[PDB]
Design a protein around this ligand. Structure first.
Ligand code: HEM
Lengths: 104, 416
């Protein structure tokens, strides 16, 4: 993906509920630093729904590609409000941006 | 003016009503309470939207209001109805224990702790505690028990309210709770890597030192063995009361998503976790077979009611039956084919096989009685709440009642 476009998408569509920087505060949603290779519902200090807490998957590109297309369908009962990113290219860009920023 | 909202959080939605100074406010999680502005007091609760509301607005007359919601649903409502109180619609997650001719459903009080209402009667059974986290009845009755936010677990006696044992344990709220075949010995788990085994009265504190990040869940085996699994996806076989990891299984590098055990002898057990549908007889340290018939990876599985069937549930509610004999390309139950994204359905929560074994009671967006292997039997139904997450069956198997999405609890009693 295009990391720069991914950043734009993050700023536009995710930043209002989530930080990606280390020690960034929990907002409406959990901080996403360290997201990749981590199991659902594990950000310490965030109170998840039971659905998100027990989805039982590992966040990575494949799982994010499916989630981000339609969060409610992937984790029914999530309290995250997001319709989904219908275009694959944009999903790849965002995912590539998150992969970089959430490790940095 | 300044009308404080219920408890504390952050408002997701709100709506003032010019009539009666009303305030229909969806705080969070579809908490669409009917408050009264300026007077600054709630008028009445309004349960009934699935997906956490998406929006509400009053009629220009103000005599009614629309309720847009994430499900894709708009519910009309009269102004008068909301004000009147309706302390009903049981709490979303409950445990029900079936002892024969009458079935009792675990409940959480609309205000505080709980009330036990038996079916086919108005016999409420209220109890007091500082908001119980979870509950469990003792084997052979005679007791009742509950967890706590601190992970403490009391076991109140039925014969006398004065007698109880309280256990202080776990960094947070206790997760799974289960009792031994003996009336004694509590077993529990939570954020701790260890699986708690706290015998009550004796106040014993045997631990299952699994050295996991945490143990996700555990279940009783027919032996003294105590089955368990964590977020590492290990399918451990411990022992009841005494902690002892006798047989250890690493069926999944990822978390064990749903694992079901058959319940005749200890002849089989299986699990699937977005990878492979493994199955074992415990005799081997590795599963007797590793089903790989699903490239989309099976999400959950359940054993036949003392038969040879073994359902394997997909994320889209698809079910693939597999004979309990290593494995063979059995016709997929294939319960749902055409539908779409329109309603309630997500999740493949549970499967309830008929005692005949000729029927599977699928329960996702709603109950449907798929016929085993090709086609469906009694598919019909269609739940009001949707999203059932639990299955209860009477020994007879005559009655199963589901409460889904907090719609309420529904009881079924087929006739002649
Ligand atoms: C494309 C933009 C977004 C991305 C990439 C994103 C990322 C994520 C991820 C990966 C999770 C689950 C991670 C985990 O299980 O720990 C999550 C959960 C969550 N997100 Fe988002 N999110 C986005 C948009 C939003 C928006 C718009 C909101 C609110 C308006 C929001 C609020 C939440 C909340 C509340 C949760 C917790 C879910 C629960 O506990 O049930 N997110 N987000």
């Amino acid at each position: 993906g295009d990391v720069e476009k991914g950043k734009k998408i993050f700023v536009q569509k995710c930043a209002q509920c989530h930080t990606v920087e280390k020690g960034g505060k929990h907002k409406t949603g959990p901080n996403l630093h360290g997201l990749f290779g981590r199991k659902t519902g594990q950000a310490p200090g965030f109170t998840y729904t039971d659905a998100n807490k027990n989805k039982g998957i590992t966040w990575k590109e494949e799982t994010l590609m499916e989630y981000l297309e339609n969060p409610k369908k992937y984790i029914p009962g999530t309290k995250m409000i997001f319709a989904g990113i219908k275009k694959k290219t944009e999903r790849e860009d965002l995912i590539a941006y998150l992969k970089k920023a959430t490790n940095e | 003016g300044e009308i404080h909202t219920g408890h504390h959080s952050t408002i997701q939605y709100c709506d003032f009503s010019p009539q009666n100074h009303l305030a229909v406010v969806a705080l969070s999680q579809y908490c669409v309470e009917l408050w009264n502005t300026d007077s600054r007091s709630k008028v009445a609760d309004c349960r009934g939207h699935l997906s956490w509301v998406h929006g509400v607005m009053f009629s220009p007359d103000g005599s009614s209001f629309l309720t847009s919601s994430d499900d894709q649903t708009i519910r009309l409502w009269e102004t008068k109805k909301v004000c009147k109180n309706s302390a009903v619609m049981l709490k979303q997650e409950v445990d029900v224990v079936f002892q024969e001719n009458e079935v009792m459903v675990l409940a959480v009080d609309h205000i505080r702790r709980l009330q036990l209402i038996n079916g086919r009667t108005g016999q409420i059974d209220y109890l007091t505690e500082a908001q119980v986290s979870c509950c469990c009845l003792s084997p052979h009755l005679q007791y009742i028990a509950f967890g706590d936010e601190n992970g403490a677990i009391e076991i109140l006696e039925l014969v006398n309210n004065r007698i109880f044992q309280s256990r202080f344990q776990h960094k947070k709220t206790v997760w799974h709770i289960q009792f031994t075949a003996d009336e004694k010995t509590l077993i529990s788990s939570s954020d701790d890597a260890e699986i708690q085994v706290w015998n009550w009265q004796l106040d014993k504190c045997i631990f299952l030192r699994g050295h996991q990040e945490t143990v996700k869940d555990f279940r009783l085996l027919k032996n003294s063995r105590l089955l368990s699994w964590s977020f590492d996806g290990t399918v451990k076989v411990w022992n009841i009361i005494t902690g002892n990891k006798e047989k250890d299984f690493v069926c999944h590098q990822g978390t064990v998503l749903s694992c079901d055990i058959s319940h005749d002898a200890t002849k089989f057990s299986s699990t699937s976790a977005d990878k492979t549908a493994k199955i074992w007889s415990f005799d081997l340290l590795l599963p007797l077979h590793e089903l790989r018939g699903h490239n989309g990876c099976v999400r959950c599985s359940a054993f036949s009611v003392d038969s040879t069937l073994l359902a394997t549930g997909d994320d889209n509610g698809e079910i693939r039956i597999w004979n309990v004999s290593n494995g063979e390309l059995l016709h997929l139950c294939a319960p749902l084919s055409e539908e779409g994204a329109a309603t309630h359905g997500g999740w493949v929560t549970d499967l309830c096989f008929s005692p005949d074994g000729k029927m599977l009671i699928s329960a996702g967006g709603y109950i449907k009685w798929w016929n085993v292997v090709t086609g469906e039997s009694s598919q019909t139904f269609y739940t009001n709440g949707t999203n059932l997450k639990k299955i209860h069956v009477s020994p007879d198997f005559k009655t199963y009642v589901t409460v889904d999405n907090l719609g309420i609890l529904y009881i079924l009693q087929t006739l002649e």
